[PDB]
Amino acid sequence: MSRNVDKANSVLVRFQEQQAESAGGYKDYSRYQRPRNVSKVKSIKEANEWKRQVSKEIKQKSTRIYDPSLNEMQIAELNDELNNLFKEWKRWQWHID
Amino acid sequence: SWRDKSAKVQVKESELPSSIPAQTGLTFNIWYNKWSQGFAGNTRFVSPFALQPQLHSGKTRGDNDGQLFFCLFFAKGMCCLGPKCEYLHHIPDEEDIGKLALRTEALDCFGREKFADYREDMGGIGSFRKKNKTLYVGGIDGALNSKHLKPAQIESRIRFVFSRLGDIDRIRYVESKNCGFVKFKYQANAEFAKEAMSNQTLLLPSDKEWDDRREGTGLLVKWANEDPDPAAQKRLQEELKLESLNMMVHLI
Amino acid sequence: LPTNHNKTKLLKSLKNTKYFQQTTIDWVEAGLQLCRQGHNMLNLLIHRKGLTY
Amino acid sequence: NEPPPNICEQCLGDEANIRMTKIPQGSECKICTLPFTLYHFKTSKRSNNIIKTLICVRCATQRNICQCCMLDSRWHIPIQLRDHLISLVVMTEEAKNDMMKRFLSLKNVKLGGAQITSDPSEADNIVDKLKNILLSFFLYNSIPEWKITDTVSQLLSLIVNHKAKCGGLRFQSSELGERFVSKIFIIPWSTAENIKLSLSLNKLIQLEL
Amino acid sequence: PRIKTRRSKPAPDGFEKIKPTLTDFEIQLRDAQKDKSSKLAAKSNEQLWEIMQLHHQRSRYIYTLYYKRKAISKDLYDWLIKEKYADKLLIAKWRKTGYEKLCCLRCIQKNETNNGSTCICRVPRAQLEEEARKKGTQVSFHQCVHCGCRGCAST
Amino acid sequence: PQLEARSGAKAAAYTPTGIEHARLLPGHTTLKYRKF
Amino acid sequence: SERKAINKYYPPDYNPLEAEKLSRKMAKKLKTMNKSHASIRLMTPFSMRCLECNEYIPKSRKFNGKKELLKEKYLDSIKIYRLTISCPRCANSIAFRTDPGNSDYVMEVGGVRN
Amino acid sequence: YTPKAEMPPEHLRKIINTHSDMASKMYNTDKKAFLGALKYLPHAILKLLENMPHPWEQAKEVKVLYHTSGAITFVNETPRVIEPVYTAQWSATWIAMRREKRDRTHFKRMRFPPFDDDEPPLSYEQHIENIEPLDPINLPLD
Amino acid sequence: HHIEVVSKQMDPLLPRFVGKKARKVVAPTENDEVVPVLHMDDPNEW
RNA sequence: GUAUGUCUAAAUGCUCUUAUUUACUAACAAAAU
Ligand SMILES: [Zn+2]
Ligand SMILES: [Zn+2]
Ligand SMILES: [Zn+2]
Numbered sequence A: 001m002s003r004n005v006d007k008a009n010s011v012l013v014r015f016q017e018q019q020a021e022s023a024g025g026y027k028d029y030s031r032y033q034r035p036r037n038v039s040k041v042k043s044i045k046e047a048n049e050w051k052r053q054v055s056k057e058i059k060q061k062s063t064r065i066y067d068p069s070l071n072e073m074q075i076a077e078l079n080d081e082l083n084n085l086f087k088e089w090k091r092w093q094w095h096i097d
Numbered sequence B: 001s002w003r004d005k006s007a008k009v010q011v012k013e014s015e016l017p018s019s020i021p022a023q024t025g026l027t028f029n030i031w032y033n034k035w036s037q038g039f040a041g042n043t044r045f046v047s048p049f050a051l052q053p054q055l056h057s058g059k060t061r062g063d064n065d066g067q068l069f070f071c072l073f074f075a076k077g078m079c080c081l082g083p084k085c086e087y088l089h090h091i092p093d094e095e096d097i098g099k100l101a102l103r104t105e106a107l108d109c110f111g112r113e114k115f116a117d118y119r120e121d122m123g124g125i126g127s128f129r130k131k132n133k134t135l136y137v138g139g140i141d142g143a144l145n146s147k148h149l150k151p152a153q154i155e156s157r158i159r160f161v162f163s164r165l166g167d168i169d170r171i172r173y174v175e176s177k178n179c180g181f182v183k184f185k186y187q188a189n190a191e192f193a194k195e196a197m198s199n200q201t202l203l204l205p206s207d208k209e210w211d212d213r214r215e216g217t218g219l220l221v222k223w224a225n226e227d228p229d230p231a232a233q234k235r236l237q238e239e240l241k242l243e244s245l246n247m248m249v250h251l252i
Numbered sequence C: 001l002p003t004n005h006n007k008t009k010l011l012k013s014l015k016n017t018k019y020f021q022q023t024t025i026d027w028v029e030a031g032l033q034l035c036r037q038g039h040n041m042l043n044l045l046i047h048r049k050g051l052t053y
Numbered sequence D: 001n002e003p004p005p006n007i008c009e010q011c012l013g014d015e016a017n018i019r020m021t022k023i024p025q026g027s028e029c030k031i032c033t034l035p036f037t038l039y040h041f042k043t044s045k046r047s048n049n050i051i052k053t054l055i056c057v058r059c060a061t062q063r064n065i066c067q068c069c070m071l072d073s074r075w076h077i078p079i080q081l082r083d084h085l086i087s088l089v090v091m092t093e094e095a096k097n098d099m100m101k102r103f104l105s106l107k108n109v110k111l112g113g114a115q116i117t118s119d120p121s122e123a124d125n126i127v128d129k130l131k132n133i134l135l136s137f138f139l140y141n142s143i144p145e146w147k148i149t150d151t152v153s154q155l156l157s158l159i160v161n162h163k164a165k166c167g168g169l170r171f172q173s174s175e176l177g178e179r180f181v182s183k184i185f186i187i188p189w190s191t192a193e194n195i196k197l198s199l200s201l202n203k204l205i206q207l208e209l
Numbered sequence E: 001p002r003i004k005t006r007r008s009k010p011a012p013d014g015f016e017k018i019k020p021t022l023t024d025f026e027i028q029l030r031d032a033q034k035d036k037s038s039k040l041a042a043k044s045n046e047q048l049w050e051i052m053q054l055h056h057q058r059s060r061y062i063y064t065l066y067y068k069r070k071a072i073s074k075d076l077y078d079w080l081i082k083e084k085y086a087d088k089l090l091i092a093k094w095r096k097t098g099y100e101k102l103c104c105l106r107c108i109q110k111n112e113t114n115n116g117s118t119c120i121c122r123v124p125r126a127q128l129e130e131e132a133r134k135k136g137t138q139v140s141f142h143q144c145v146h147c148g149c150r151g152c153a154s155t
Numbered sequence F: 001p002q003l004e005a006r007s008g009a010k011a012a013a014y015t016p017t018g019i020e021h022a023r024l025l026p027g028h029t030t031l032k033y034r035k036f
Numbered sequence G: 001s002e003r004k005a006i007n008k009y010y011p012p013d014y015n016p017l018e019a020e021k022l023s024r025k026m027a028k029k030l031k032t033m034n035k036s037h038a039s040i041r042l043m044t045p046f047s048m049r050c051l052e053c054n055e056y057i058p059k060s061r062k063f064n065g066k067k068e069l070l071k072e073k074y075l076d077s078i079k080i081y082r083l084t085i086s087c088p089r090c091a092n093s094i095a096f097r098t099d100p101g102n103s104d105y106v107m108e109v110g111g112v113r114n
Numbered sequence H: 001y002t003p004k005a006e007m008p009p010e011h012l013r014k015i016i017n018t019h020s021d022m023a024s025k026m027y028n029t030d031k032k033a034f035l036g037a038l039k040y041l042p043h044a045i046l047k048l049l050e051n052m053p054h055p056w057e058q059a060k061e062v063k064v065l066y067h068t069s070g071a072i073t074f075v076n077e078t079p080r081v082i083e084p085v086y087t088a089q090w091s092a093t094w095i096a097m098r099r100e101k102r103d104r105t106h107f108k109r110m111r112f113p114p115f116d117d118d119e120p121p122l123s124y125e126q127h128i129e130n131i132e133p134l135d136p137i138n139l140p141l142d
Numbered sequence I: 001h002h003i004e005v006v007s008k009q010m011d012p013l014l015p016r017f018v019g020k021k022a023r024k025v026v027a028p029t030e031n032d033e034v035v036p037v038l039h040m041d042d043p044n045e046w
Numbered sequence J: 001g002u003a004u005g006u007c008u009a010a011a012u013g014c015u016c017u018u019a020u021u022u023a024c025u026a027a028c029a030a031a032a033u
């Protein structure tokens, strides 16, 4: 399990995380992938967390896309990615509450 | 009239004063009392208690002995010692302020060292360099559980909470900034107010979201970075001048 | 060949303070205390060091 | 080697005997964040709460202040105020930085003004100069609410906006109000023209944002 | 008390009479000796104070029966002393003049204290009160931090 | 590169650490002397 | 605390099978582990030119690549891998495949061997 | 000057018990004290070990100093003996051991460690109350 | 006013010199008086 | 010797597959009869 990722997703760590989730309510919304279809999330806190995560992602995307080699295609691709992120964020701002 | 109003206080009994931390992290660090191996959680949670001062305020073991400094816990609204507390339980009156006005430079009305530099977030116990009586209120969205209220209503609510807590100089709610500036007469009073209203809900019993006030995040009450718009500045200058004049008079 | 000078043993110095006081204890009890206290010390230090894992 | 503690007369107390303990490199000074000896005294034996020194002697010397009170050694005024007065007749800029503050503390220049306060010559002169220099109901028509409240009390919840200049006092009792009216700055119930105009303008201002 | 290990003989004559009195104490002690999650310094101190008081009380009871009332045999008293029940030093102090009402021994360790003196408890309420009156303020101290002892003095 | 030579050393005095160095431990308290 | 640590501490209730099951349940949800292009450190055997900016990355030069499994195996039961690299100057994704028929590699729309 | 106050063991016990679940801003300084105490923990260990009750002894009472913070506890007394007497005692114990060996088909040797790594060592207050500690090693006299 | 200084015996467990924490400190030279640096009085070879 | 750095506003249970590993790390060391 060299290079840290393996360590992170080693069974023991996972178990610990699960335990934390069970007792006290420590989740790491960084750690899990954000769900595709909203309205399968009855809790508000979770939703908020997800929204926050997406915002963070968007910010990250923004930070990188103004790099100096602007003509490279990665940046262009991200522009679409950025849009997608924005859309997701908007969706997360649903009007149930 | 806190003296003849009552003696007793007993705000939150020592059966249930507080649980110690709130789980961020995986493991609990014994030396810092803070959860480690992770940081996911906005952390600020609403006070389970509050200072309903007219009911609570009273004579203490401190009052008799001649204590200067007021009870932080009382302010917060959770002083389980109550009548046997050594720190004072009332809203800082003028006489009291006058009495501890010598010390009020170096340390707060709670008897705890004011710092030389402000905290970067203006978040707690103000500096001894800059005297202040002026509190930033914030997180009013969060403190009211994202309620669609009128700004005016919010302002009124703020006034209600803060007037009770100390002699007000002046208050401003702002729609654009989404905040509530308050200014007091005495720094001590302001400090007390801050202590009280840190992590407090602005909601009332009559509101429909009273039972879920705990689930939100409280008021973010902090110190006021001076207002830049010019009239205010001018006023401040005038005040300073007046103070200087007074000092001069005292001297001669 | 031992110290000519040093009368002042460790315990004596401690006694001379106000922070220590002294009891008579069952030896097993004392041992238990040591185990607990010692354990606490090692945890506390470890936690300070930051390594909570 | 160590220099002595600079504690003022009002700081220390009113008695002809005080006992204090020195704690060498006790705490870091609040200004400089640099180890120094804490003196802490109890004033009168039985009077509660100690008085610990919060600053290093050097820093005190530089500012010319009580090591407890944080006030001018001479005139017993907050550093700002004392310095401000001097300026009126230049003020200190404590540099709020981790490293730089320490450096500032170690410098021995008497920062700003302190010199004047120290010397009988200079302080006295400044003082002289200063002397010379010296020688329910809505409410309409800036001043603080704690004054307004006081006034009301004298006359016998009190909302007042300043951008509006529109103070809606609510005693919540017909007795208090009817006493208040007889015992007596426009004050109706729930150059007059000029005043009205000004009020209107204020209201407009309040309402545009 | 210590634990019996056939070192000293089980008990002398009159132990059966007093035992039920000083066995109430044991229960109290047991209640005391545990995690009362005090969550607060003063509260924590209070339990210690209580414990101290309890300790004192048993000794007093023993002392009272042996010296003042004199209803217990010397041998029994000696046995008790040998066991952890009574405090020997405390008893001795009590027997001496001016120390009869005495909260605990470490309230009269003059070496311990920051100011070279005895605990305040040892000042008779009278004197402190008088001082307060002279000053302007009310009665200044309630109980010391060693042991809860509101007016320990022999008066 | 940063694999670099040098211009001057240093000597700046801070607050002492209070660490129990092994060598610093006492040893040869008695100084000898000459005959005169 | 030391790389050759014999036994990792387990909680007093740690049903190992149960724990494993739990992990599995929380592996589909998991971000890492449920993804492709897992990282790797590799030297470059081909010694090739980055097709965009013509940067001549030579033999044995070390990179933090991404190894990903190609679903279409060679023959039947011997896997082949895509090994992503970036050129030092321009950030163009070079990669290559390991077709084991010739005991060597194949370039994959990154650069050219020379 | 005036000697130390012989405190009650109860107080000490209480102090110890308090600093088990220690995680408030209350006893910040107690944690510091505890940390400091590592300095003398080996000394403490040495003391306690030295006072080990000998096999002719059910349970030794022992003098104890302890920091009022609850950070460290030294067995204070240093165990001295009448040398010949001590030797005699040891001999007796040896004899007893030999006898035991002779007797027993299997001698139930301890398992180590005696308590589990999970299980936190019982407080002394679980077995003050327990029955008279079983008889120690002293041979049949005449 | 006359005043008695004392030194209280701190507990032997707690850090003796709780002030100090191995802080870096740049010092000013503070040389107010000016040192006179006095002195007296083929380039292609050298 | 398992490198590193920036970046952070305050669906539920279910079972079935194994005589393995898309395993990762190379700082460590390098010869014949
Ligand atoms: Zn209180
Ligand atoms: Zn002063
Ligand atoms: Zn007493």
Ligand SMILES: [Zn+2]
Residues within 6 Å of the ligand: E102, E103, E104, E105, E106, E107, E119, E121, E146, E147, E149
């Ligand atoms: Zn006492």
Ligand SMILES: [Zn+2]
Residues within 6 Å of the ligand: E103, E107, E119, E120, E121, E122, E144, E145, E146, E147, E149, E152
């Ligand atoms: Zn006392």
